[model samples]
Target chain A: GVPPFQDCILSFLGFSDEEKTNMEEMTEMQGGKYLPLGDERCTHLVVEENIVKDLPFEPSKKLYVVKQEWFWGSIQMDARAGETMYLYEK
Target chain B: GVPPFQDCILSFLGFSDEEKTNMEEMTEMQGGKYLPLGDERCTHLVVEENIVKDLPFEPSKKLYVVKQEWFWGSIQMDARAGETMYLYEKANTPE
Candidate 1:
């Protein structure tokens, strides 16, 4: 098992199913998990043009909401969504 | 003459000069900047494969620091550094 950084995310905001699969396998290989897109309330690690970011939870449920504004640890953000996302127990 | 997003941050951490040039021109083309990796205490938009993140300032002159923990707004993060960076006035938008 791997580190599982992407433990339970649901959406592939901008990725294809194949790309998503590759990321999912790699995630698990590195100890991460991938879940089906179950809910809008689920968490997401979004990527845009190499600019990355994450969603902690949903606010009124526009996109994902971040607890932080400046963004540091795990994610970046952009207008163009990414094809890979992650979920975790956080 | 463009948005200085990749203008001042400096080193194209992972890209080659050619790729860096593409991004720099694109940055300017689309209103971004491509700066030379000026200082270690710079803010870098680090990218690793597809996983992404950023640095706010250098901590103890180690790596760049982040003002936030759970990121949002702009900038992604990764173990690998990025080949592009920017320099804009926070409220400035275009660099």
Candidate 2:
């Protein structure tokens, strides 16, 4: 079966090492690829909500900066939830 | 002066009458127009946060369903904040 996150290239920020590992594993488990922070190929930047105000990188129209909930929520729902709702507001 | 919201056509849901009035006035002041709920010409739907889970109307790609903060925040910033941040998520923000 095609996974829900089939074409997604995900990255992370503001996560503890363990948390980052968990997220990376989750991304692969869901059939998504994990990329390093600021990789030009990234499609989503999953950020910890508290760190959004001082986000390390500039916002790019090419990729979404979303909350971690978007990752867990997509797995919970068995589908990729819309990025619009999960965007990390500054 | 071109207001920050010049092209926006906004509508409301779940706001108190006073809030609706305030929003309408602010929209006008900011160079946007106010429409009745469900107006097809509407470009954005500003919904109260608590009411988003049981929201009315199907989510449409043509319009953004956002928190009321998007309105006030845009005014505070003197620019239209991106709708991505303010989206009303059942699948969004407080401060």
Candidate 3:
């Protein structure tokens, strides 16, 4: 089964400028936090490291990463009630 | 702007039988409490009262309610981290 992180996270893998703006607006509206995940701001390795640390996930599994090139849109993340952050590898 | 209650809640306005069953399953999986918000079990007013008592919402606002007739599926609710429940008039209600 896909881990909770995979199911609930909105990965900022390959967001465009317009998409980034939409994401910002959506996050603001929903009172959610936004973090970028790309190489222009940092290398792929660094981005992966930050994501690993920020999200709660298992260290033993191969993290599912996706990259898509598209214009402007928003990604929403959802999870069950009372679930803790478990997207990072320990 | 919509109130926090309007923005954060997954209202069970006009769910079908399959939808209710799906809701039950989803709640079971997510560990969320599922409550019916319609009148097969009770009248509309009683259902409304129960909903008011159950969710953390303001008693004064015109609550935004939606009704849909569809097959079984899951609905998810989200809120910011560290936010308190404001779905009902009271701070906490019965589960």
Candidate 4:
């Protein structure tokens, strides 16, 4: 077990009430915790398909956006960021 | 302006047809590309709401699962993986 993701607090964007219910368990089971819609304390944000359409304008002009992912093949895969950390998803 | 993402490919799990349509453009605008459903080339899995209920079992016994995300705050956000690189979601986040 990799242990729970205590280092990060997550907020979901496109998830519904039903989905949120499921994640409440899934996150906890996975060693992570879930916050309400958005908590200042949240360190990470989980996004869904098209809930968003474009990266926000980096009013700061220093903002960067990146692409996130879905699963691959038969195994579950998470999004890979950092390299493309400059771009944000809609 | 920041350039679109060219390094990663993304797939959405629980978006509706309308939403997917929006992302088709959104992804392109973001500089990242979108793949239909699943493609071996996809690097990131953008999971929505509750499409996935639990993490998959590692048949190989070497696999592990982690918690993916929804957006945080008012602004949009994407899932962050790699550290906890294992887990799968149901196709219909609502189910």
Candidate 5:
């Protein structure tokens, strides 16, 4: 079967170093790419739920700002969950 | 401005009489319609979060199985919140 995150190039905002490391390893393990925040290649920004109020950035139309549940839940489900369900509403 | 529930025809699956009453009144107050459980005219079934394992019915393509948060949150937002965010995932169902 194809890997769940095969098409994802994900970055993170508002996660601690330890949590970020965990997601990085999991991302690669699931056939996804991980890049540091602000890398031009990143496709999605996995964000902490309550951090939107403190963040100063907005997602471009091409990039998605999604809740961390998209990553964690997708990993647990062994497939990418619907992004619409995990979107970070602002 | 358009009312929040203008397009909704909602019913409840797992709510108590008191809770269902609140939603029923609120639905009509916001320009939506409310019907009893199992009414064919109902457009959406607002279910309690943990009731999926016990539900005896499934949503047809024409009707939505959604979480109560979709209704409560939409009323709070004063507009309909996205239903996709509040979907009730059924067992054996994909996407």
Candidate 6:
């Protein structure tokens, strides 16, 4: 089965015509930030989904973990800001 | 002329009393991050009025714009995460 693909961009700024144009171009150029939510296998994909639920940190404190699976997809806390934090597979 | 003044707070995360108290007390609390920029202007303010020109971008991924005006304010890209970005309006103090 084709792995599920969930893609989203969250921005703190209001969307303007300029920003929208930039995002489209970036997606085409593949120049945006990519985060690895988990490992490189099909089974490892589950880890990506489960990691956020298991985090020990405060959920509301503007901090979150991003995970990416090699063949699966990417995950982010606030995917807009260059993926500043990440969780590596153990 | 009052010259146009603009102020805004942008946050990726939601706001809470903790953040509000933190910002208010920062001035009275006076302990938040502040950025200094440009130059002082009672009337030199027109320059601050116009910043963020076309910026010339092909446009696609995520990037944003922020602005600030004096005696009057603070602006941020994403304010909740430790105020990573800021702009100064001519002459202004954090208080």
Q: What does candidate 2's lDDT look like per residue over A9-86, in tens digits? A: 998765534566778998999989987666678899887765333444454678988888998999988898899998
lDDT score for candidate 6 against the true structure: 0.26
- In terms of lDDT, the best-performing candidate is 2
Alpha-carbon shift of residue A5 in model 2 (angstroms): 1.5
CA-RMSD of model 4: 18.0
Q: Cα deviation in Å at residue B66, candidate 4?
A: 36
**TM-score, one value per model:** 0.25, 0.47, 0.20, 0.34, 0.46, 0.20
Clashing pairs in 5: none
The interface root-mean-square deviations, each candidate in sequence, come to 14.4, 18.5, 17.3, 11.4, 19.9, 16.5
lDDT of 5 by residue, B1-95 (tens): 78998988988754434566778999999989977555667777777754223343444566676777888898889998777788776522224
lDDT of 4: 0.42
Error of 1 at B76 (Å): 43
RMSD of 5: 16.0
Estimate, for each residue in A1-90, the C-alpha lDDT of model 6 and write its tens digit. 211222432211112334334543443343232222221211211123321224221233342334433212332221233334343333
Write the residue-wise lDDT of candidate 1 on A1-90 in tens digits. 223244434333223234546656754554445554324444543333322343222323343422222112333332213322332212
Q: Locate the minimum summed-lDDT window of 10 residues in model 6 chain A.
A: A37-46
- Candidate 2 lDDT score at position A73: 96
By lDDT rank, best first, the candidates go 2, 5, 4, 1, 3, 6
By TM-score: ranked, best first: 2, 5, 4, 1, 6, 3
lDDT of 4 at A22: 68
Candidate 3 regions with alpha-carbon error over 4 angstroms: A1-90, B1-11, B38-95
- Per-residue alpha-carbon lDDT of model 4 for B4-80, expressed as tens digits? 34454656545444455666676676666766443445555555534443222111222212223421110143432
lDDT of 3 by residue, B11-76 (tens): 342122344455556544543443333212211111122212232222223332322211011132
CA lDDT of B50 in candidate 3? 27
TM-score of chain B of 6: 0.20
- Candidate with the larger lDDT of 3 and 4: 4
lDDT of 1 by residue, B51-78 (tens): 2243222223233322222111233332
